[PDB]
Design a protein around this ligand. Structure first.
Ligand SMILES: CN1CCN(c2ccc(Nc3ncc4nc(Nc5ccccc5)n(C5CCCC5)c4n3)cc2)CC1
Ligand SMILES: [Cl-]
Length: 302
């Protein structure tokens, strides 16, 4: 086990301003923001994640764990933490994704969403997931909701709160593998299953898995050998890949690097693998912004 030498960056509240609430839920809320690095003359669009006035340590322990992980990852399809604020309750500052989470995005723009885009997102998500495997990280919460859109072409994974190192002792049932549901066993292969469902959400355009079904039931349903239905737009090949992710034997399940390859192939001839109406037709997209720089463009030594 190599040492983790990731730098953790501490940011003064003066450095950035919250502009809007992108989302609020539970303990904490997320704000669109602008961050200006000290003496740098760059403005970086950011999302700031903060919990409540309530500052309970247990909450803080959880947030910081999440920050730790985000600080430690560097991939194009993985979200990275820029810095943290220690003002009163802690805040996580990370690059902003203008178009939001993917799950919302498919639902909003389904009429204008191409097959090519869908296959690419699969490729990119598998790329992100493979990188986590490389770092021996298990996301343990893969879902469409946890995927964010920098641009229609570019997407990255997020929400590393449940993330853990492989083989470490240390709840979305529908996403969870069966082995995990019965025994709380998590592995990269468990992650792959969750990926399968994530793929299904996109194909199904944001439809909720196992809709109308109580979670307690789900374990039995999976036990029976029941699985999610093949989506209308899905070719047999694409669905078949999905089903492989839902195999009882985790080893039987496809590796993330294999998933990248297979979906890659399909993206070369997207129309053959997904059938969508008017696929060809579809196309997809404060005063001073001169200094604006994207987080990807903004780099620091090390
Ligand atoms: C219909 N509306 C469309 C616009 N919209 C939206 C939401 C988020 C973004 N961007 C963005 N960026 C970074 C984020 N980081 C977290 N979360 C997060 C997790 C860990 C560390 C830092 C942030 N989020 C969450 C995703 C949904 C609510 C905000 C983030 N969201 C852009 C537009 C809300 C829905
Ligand atoms: Cl759930």
């Amino acid at each position: 086990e190599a040492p983790n030498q990731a730098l953790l960056r501490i940011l003064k509240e003066t450095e950035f301003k919250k502009i809007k609430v992108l989302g609020s839920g539970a303990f904490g809320t997320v704000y669109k923001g602008l961050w200006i690095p000290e003496g740098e003359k760059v403005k970086i669009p950011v999302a700031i994640k903060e919990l409540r006035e309530a500052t309970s340590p247990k909450a803080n322990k959880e947030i910081l764990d999440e920050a730790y992980v985000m600080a430690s990852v560097d991939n194009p399809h993985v979200c990275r933490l820029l810095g943290i604020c220690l003002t009163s309750t802690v805040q996580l500052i990370t690059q902003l994704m203008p178009f939001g989470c993917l799950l919302d995005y498919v639902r909003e723009h389904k009429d204008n969403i191409g097959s090519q885009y869908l296959l690419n997102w699969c490729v990119q998500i598998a790329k992100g997931m493979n990188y986590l495997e490389d770092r021996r990280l298990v996301h343990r919460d893969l879902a469409a909701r946890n995927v964010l859109v920098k641009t229609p072409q570019h997407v990255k994974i997020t929400d590393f709160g449940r993330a853990k190192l492989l083989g470490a002792e240390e709840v979305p049932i529908k996403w969870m593998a069966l082995e995990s549901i019965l025994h709380r066993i998590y592995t990269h292969q468990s992650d792959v299953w969750s990926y399968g469902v994530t793929v299904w959400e996109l194909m199904t355009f944001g439809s909720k898995p196992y809709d109308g079904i109580p979670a307690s039931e789900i374990s039995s349903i999976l036990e029976k050998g029941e699985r999610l239905p093949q989506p209308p737009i899905c070719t047999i090949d694409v669905y078949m890949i999905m089903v492989k992710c839902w195999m009882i034997d985790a080893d039987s399940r496809p590796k993330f690097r294999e998933l990248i390859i297979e979906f890659s192939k399909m993206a070369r001839d997207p129309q053959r693998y997904l059938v969508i109406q008017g696929d060809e037709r579809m196309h997809l997209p404060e005063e001073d912004m001169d200094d604006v720089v994207d987080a990807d463009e903004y780099l620091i030594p090390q």
